[PDB]
């Protein structure tokens, strides 16, 4: 009897995403 409780507070923001992949390794230099 009487009002129901307030909704719980909104959840926390999700964890930060995974680190981005490394860039491609550069090609080796041209022959001399």
């Amino acid at each position: 009897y009487g009002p129901d409780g307030d909704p719980g507070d909104p959840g926390d923001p999700g964890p930060d995403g995974k680190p981005g992949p490394d860039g491609p390794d550069g090609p080796d230099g041209d022959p001399g």
């Binding site: 009487g2 719980g8 959840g11 550069g26 080796d28 230099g29 022959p31």
Partner: protein, 31 residues
Amino acid sequence: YGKPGPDGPDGPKGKPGPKGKPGKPGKPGKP
């Protein structure tokens, strides 16, 4: 008093991850 309140709304989506490390430099060319 009434029933316990509803479970809270889900939180927002996380932030994007950090940009990846640079690729390795290429090695010097053969002489």
